[PDB]
Design a protein around this ligand. Structure first.
Ligand SMILES: *CCS(=O)(=O)Nc1ccnc2[nH]ccc12
Length: 337
């Protein structure tokens, strides 16, 4: 078996000539299809691995990363590592934003593809819950694919409510304000906020709300949106959350065209609607696609939806380590000779 940087990366004779990318991700030559592919090693096991495999095997969409192959040992007893084989993608939006200025045409096209993929995910009653530039892969022709469904959940708006300062798992800079106030992130509006943040970041190459800790994230958001309105406050019924907001000095709204003096005015209109404080008033993915900014691309007949809502059969949260390994083994069975 081949090794890469002091790690065994043992991907049978099908995949050869391994180079590191970023458990470990390597590129490799697929000797069957005769293209370089991406392979990630997962090494007891995690709910997130299973969640992702079930979702990505069920999903089929041009703006969502697929799984092409999964490599594992023939038996549960011998299975330790799982390798997931996917299309090689030259770069991601995080790497691209660190090094490149995007034209308005590129920002428009990337945003379109993000929302087109998101329309499909949401149509399956799934929330991604960790959209950020590093989860948006790109190839040399700027095709974009959404990846990393390890924190994805079936939508559950009736159980979205929680108390103030409830701990959350997803990446801090892309968290909607309501996460810090009264939300478990179980509604589609959570993903739109992330997309808003990403749009802002494409406009200036810098994260819009780079909070350094849990409540600082909310301070950054309010520093630009300004103080919530009485009506938006009245929607927050939780008294700890409400009174925290009432305790803050008045903050004026920073005009988008002053933060983003170079941006297209239609892009800023859409940004505003995605970065709305009140999640009920926030634009939905299909409205976003229909927005004038995206007129050159918008075509709902060519923005497919999922054939059915996605379902986890049992609650993965209480699963002992043994049943989880067995579930991963079973979900990966179709790729065995
Ligand atoms: C989805 C982000 S990842 O880091 O999990 N996977 C990944 C990284 C780099 N290049 C890739 N090509 C396909 C999948 C990846």
């Amino acid at each position: 078996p081949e090794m890469v940087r002091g790690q065994v990366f043992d991907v049978g004779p099908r995949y050869t000539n391994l180079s590191y990318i970023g458990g470990m991700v390597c590129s490799a030559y697929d000797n069957v299809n005769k293209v370089r592919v991406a392979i990630k090693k997962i090494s007891t096991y995690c709910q997130r691995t299973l969640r992702e495999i079930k979702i990505l095997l069920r999903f089929r969409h041009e703006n969502i990363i697929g799984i092409n192959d999964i490599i594992r040992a023939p038996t549960i007893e011998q299975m330790k590592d799982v390798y997931i084989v996917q299309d090689l993608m030259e770069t991601d939006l995080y790497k691209l934003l660190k090094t490149q200025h995007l034209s308005n045409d590129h920002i428009c096209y990337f945003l379109y593809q993000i929302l087109r993929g998101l329309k499909y995910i949401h149509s399956a009653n799934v929330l991604h819950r960790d959209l950020k530039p590093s989860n948006l892969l790109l190839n040399t022709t700027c095709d974009l694919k959404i990846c990393d469904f390890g924190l994805a959940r079936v939508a559950d708006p009736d159980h979205d409510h929680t108390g103030f300062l409830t701990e959350y798992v997803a990446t801090r800079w892309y968290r909607a304000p309501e996460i810090m106030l009264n939300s478990k992130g179980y509604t589609k509006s959570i993903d739109i906020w992330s997309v808003g943040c990403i749009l802002a970041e494409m406009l200036s190459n810098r994260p819009i709300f780079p909070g350094k800790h849990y409540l600082d994230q909310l301070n950054h958001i309010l520093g630009i949106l300004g103080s919530p309105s009485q009506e938006d406050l009245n929607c927050i019924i939780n008294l700890k959350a409400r009174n925290y907001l009432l305790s803050l000095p008045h903050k004026n709204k920073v005009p988008w065209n002053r933060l983003f003096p170079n941006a297209d005015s239609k892009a800023l209109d859409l940004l505003d609607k995605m970065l709305t404080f009140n999640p009920h008033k926030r634009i939905e993915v299909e409205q976003a696609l229909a927005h004038p900014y995206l007129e050159q691309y918008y075509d709902p007949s060519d923005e497919p939806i999922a054939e059915a809502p996605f379902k986890f059969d049992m609650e993965l949260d209480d699963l002992p380590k043994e049943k989880l390994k067995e579930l991963i083994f079973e979900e990966t069975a179709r790729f065995q000779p």
